[PDB]
Ligand binder design. Structure first.
Ligand SMILES: [Cu+2]
Ligand SMILES: [Cu+2]
Ligand code: NA
Ligand code: NA
Ligand code: NA
Ligand code: NA
Lengths: 620, 620
């Protein structure tokens, strides 16, 4: 009954049938994206209309289409032909990945390059990577993937240990032509294997780890209704899933006495870019937009009980569409559970004699995705005290290269002859704010140091200052860790009992933003990543910080074009976009499989409640 | 048998007997500090000598003494009379705290101030606070405490809800004289109570939280031998306890194959300062040195199973001395346990078909202390992958004042008429480094941005740079979050298999440092807090960043005087001192009892191992 319910297999089958009957899903067509559309602002008329957005690719070279379908009414609402040289190419299809290796295996230039290196083509795996936009005029309007080669000595070998440096190819995956093969010179293929399940590498496994048993004898404290509606310790929300963004949180609200108070209307990771910092022409084009180009939701893992998620786990199994419009279930793709989180509050008072301790807990909503060599975990946390936190977990196998004789300023050495180029992993969180409703504003808060003098005779005073961001043109902000800079999202029309506007404070990790030269292709295509915080006025069609069609888009789409509208954001329906990321100089300890590293952000209440919201927590 | 074993009750009784027979512990004497001394550098001759350092106060006004005793030989090694006007006063005695309220209760000025406010003196609690050094010439060489007043309406009332603003007194606790009573004007005493166990404030307690059961059916994976020696998942260390510093970690080492490899010789929180930023003369002197002035170890809590520490807990019960030299056990004062810590490493490989997941865990060593209104948790974490992390947890009741009519730039409003002055909580971690032995060096690592141009034609390259700190005069460093600044501690004489020096990288949280004017008293006394990182050459007597005698010391002691020696630290026996802290602008949600907030730091291996050190972890 809820408009925010997950897409059903039956809905996806109906979409397929509607598209086919409209003549839009012939044998040459492929679905590159399918997702449910959120309700438009002000759907309080109960007139639900379940609408889906579809990107349709054509493998014969005809123009792709963007289509909107109403499952409710069984009709095609609109269908638009796309000029991809102008607005960007569609996301990469899973079936295009295998095309690259197969096409190169019969190309005379590729075979000559492998022959010079004494490599058997049957052992050469090709990583098919997105192309970006660079100097090659012949690529405009064509679907291009670039391929880098790795040797697999046997079927269970980790090919990442054996990069074939000095060699790259470009492939037109629609016309099935190899456009360029570039060979800059022969590097030795690193010979040491990286097989982290090989007993010769692991040694005897430890026998010292005794079991930790986490159980909930009476079941979990949260309830799931309507398939995806969560209620837990005064929190209320809906867990959505989209093939591009992955897990999306809707309608985050907190039950404060008799009132259900909204906090965030929609929360998601709306883009994530992995730019590489190696200037070698073999890799200097290398930038993954995992969300926008590959779609992280479609590569979600099935999570195993006891290994991936430990404790009393409740799973969601979202349904997506395959390239032909058939429903596909991602079994156990989302884990949900609560976790003990240490001490919540504690005080032993000498004067009253009262000793007081309470324990904290958090609700966890997570999924894991695998894109080639990398694996990313996305974790959303809700805490008893009103804190909301996001954490990304990065693991998997680092992307490798040869390590040059004589060293490198842009590549780490991991093993003899084996290098790992420097790179970043940068995320964009899109937070459609709704602090006590939709009239919100953002203030930038800095610590203020004060000079010793009159009114501050002992030189101990310090203060803070808040600056309201009033228009989009002034709402592109940078971090300043030294001044303790944070941002407060408040509702100027909703006051706490002290007559102050209710608010939430965003705490960033203050990690470096995009390092590339501002004149680079990646700086133009990932402009969101060059600043820590953006605020825009809500609009239905402003969904992603990089635009709708990221693959091979020439740049400027998304946030820089949105904020040019210079709209009023002072007490309006606003969206906060926060950039955060990891800068990775690989270490020896990251090889041959990398231990998890993390980055994230959190939001804490700031005068949202009239007092601590956890006074009614019982004494365990 | 280990020289690093905890002090025994029998050792403390022997110290008392040695002091008494030497004529050093008559009825007028009080022990203000007693602690075991660490072995001097190069104790590999097995010639153990258990020595204790003692500070002896005299309640009759005679000069205090610093005494060193050998329990092994039953002798007084040295006894020195202290000139406290020169070198500082001894730490505050617990018995001096009650003296303040009792003395004020019979002072005519204090009684007149309370009478004007219609307060019954029997209901007025006085917080006895350290004095610092300001403009009052009569305080030089005297033991002074300053008192701030709070109303307790009934014996179980939280007095913190009822500050009596506009009033402060200074007390000489040796001569038992009230030196000054300052009354700047009558403020209304805030009337709302802050009793967080009162059903009228909490409402009905939640019935929604279902139990989380954490158990270890086969016991924990760590072993404890010799009372305080820990072995856990290749880690080895000794857990010490000192009445000033609290938990101290000794001899942190990692078993890498056949080699026990040292990492940190001694790790502790060597000072912690809480400076207040309210320029009112009632509070502008207010600065707590919890470690140096009060001694955080002697106020350690007894931790309750299931409430404070959850899971399979192993306790240590350290022994300290009371003011008369009798041993006192802090029952269950240290909790030790292991915790599941999520995913350690994960990869699903398309080419090899291998799916791999391993789980992480951490060892936790913690204690909790209560100083007046504040409660602090100190947590040390060891992770499977070689990471060492410290985390401080701040909770308790915020220090309060009146909230002025017309507002304040330096005080938050928490309730009608009730304010909470701005302040910081700043810690100093002393890390006596021993990366693969004692020849260590520190490098500062910054990210380096590169310009688009020749050799970087696509403008994607970025790099990093490392600067060796060679002398103490250049080893006072500031954070720079924007350039991703970290510090690497390496051993230039110990190489990994790639012929690179082994190292560990310190990751700071990059929070603001001391905000006070650099010309203030607190900036001179807490100079360590004005910079993020200090490196010194190890010396036996350079123990604390603030010097040995912090109470009422005029300033400059500790780190600024140490580094003036400008000693060589390039491949030497070195000590890293890291400043980190929280800047607290109190929020409504912090009242009437504050949910935990955290700050800390971590160290991760950086080419210390030859590959990932967790390949031999089993598959659960
Ligand atoms: Cu990485
Ligand atoms: Cu505080
Ligand atoms: Na274009
Ligand atoms: Na909004
Ligand atoms: Na002095
Ligand atoms: Na050292």
């Amino acid at each position: 009954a809820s408009p925010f319910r997950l897409a059903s297999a039956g809905e996806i089958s109906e979409v397929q049938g509607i598209l086919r009957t409209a003549g839009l899903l012939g044998p040459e067509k492929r679905i590159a994206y399918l997702g449910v559309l959120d309700p438009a602002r002000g759907a309080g008329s109960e007139a639900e209309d379940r609408r889906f957005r579809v990107f349709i690719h054509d493998v014969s070279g005809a123009r792709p289409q963007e289509v909107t379908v109403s499952v409710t009414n069984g009709t095609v609402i609109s269908a638009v032909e796309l000029d991809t040289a102008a607005t960007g190419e569609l996301p990469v299809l899973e079936e295009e990945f295998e095309v690259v290796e197969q096409l190169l295996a019969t190309d005379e230039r590729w075979l000559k390059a492998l022959a010079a290196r004494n490599l058997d083509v049957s052992k050469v795996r090709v990583a098919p990577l997105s192309a970006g936009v660079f100097e090659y005029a012949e690529e405009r309007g064509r679907r291009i993937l670039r391929g880098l080669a790795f040797v697999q000595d046997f079927p269970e070998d980790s090919a990442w240990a054996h990069p074939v440096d000095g060699l790259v190819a470009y492939v037109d995956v629609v016309s099935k032509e190899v456009t360029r093969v570039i060979d800059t010179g022969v590097f030795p293929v690193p010979a040491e294997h990286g097989n982290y399940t090989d007993p010769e590498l692991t040694g005897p496994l430890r026998t010292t780890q005794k079991p930790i048993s986490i159980t909930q004898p009476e079941g979990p404290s949260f309830t799931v209704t309507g398939g995806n509606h969560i209620e837990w310790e005064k929190w209320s929300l809906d867990v959505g899933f989209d093939v591009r963004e992955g897990v999306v949180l809707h309608n985050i609200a907190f039950r404060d006495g008799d009132r259900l108070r909204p906090i965030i209307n929609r929360a998601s990771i709306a883009e994530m870019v992995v730019p590489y910092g190696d200037p070698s022409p073999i890799r200097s084009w290398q930038n993954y937009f995992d969300t926008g180009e590959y779609l992280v939701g479609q590569y979600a893992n099935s999570l195993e009980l006891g290994c991936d998620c430990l404790g009393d786990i409740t799973y969601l199994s979202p349904v997506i569409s395959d390239a032909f419009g058939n429903p596909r279930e991602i079994r156990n793709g989302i884990c949900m559970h609560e976790e003990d989180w240490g001490i919540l509050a504690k005080h032993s008072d000498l004067w009253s004699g009262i000793n007081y301790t309470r324990r904290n807990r958090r609700m966890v909503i997570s999924f894991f995705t695998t894109i080639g060599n990398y694996d990313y975990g996305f974790y959303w946390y809700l805490y008893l005290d009103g804190t909301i936190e996001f954490e990304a977990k990065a693991t998997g196998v680092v992307f490798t290269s040869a390590f040059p004789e004589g060293g490198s300023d842009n590549i780490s050495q991991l093993a003899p002859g084996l290098g790992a180029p420097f790179h970043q992993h940068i995320f964009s969180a899109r937070l459609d704010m709704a602090i006590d409703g939709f009239t919100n504003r953002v203030e930038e808060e800095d610590v203020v140091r004060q000079t010793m003098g009159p009114g501050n005779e002992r030189g101990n005073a310090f203060s803070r200052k808040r600056t309201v961001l009033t228009r989009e043109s002034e709402a592109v902000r940078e971090a300043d860790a030294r001044t303790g800079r944070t941002w407060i999202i408040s509702n100027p029309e909703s006051k706490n009992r002290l007559n102050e506007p209710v608010g939430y404070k965003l705490h960033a990790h203050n990690q470096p933003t995009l390092l590339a030269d501002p004149g680079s292709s990646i700086a133009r295509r990932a402009a969101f990543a060059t600043k820590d915080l953006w605020v825009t006025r809500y609009a239905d069609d402003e969904r992603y910080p990089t635009g709708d069609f990221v693959n091979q888009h020439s740049g400027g789409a998304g946030l820089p074009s949105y904020i040019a509208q210079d709209r009023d954001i002072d007490g309006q329906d606003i969206v906060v976009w926060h950039t955060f990321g990891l800068t990775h100089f690989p270490r020896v300890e990251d090889w041959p499989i990398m231990p998890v590293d993390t980055v994230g952000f959190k939001l804490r209440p700031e005068g949202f409640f009239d007092r601590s919201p956890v006074l009614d927590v019982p004494a365990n």
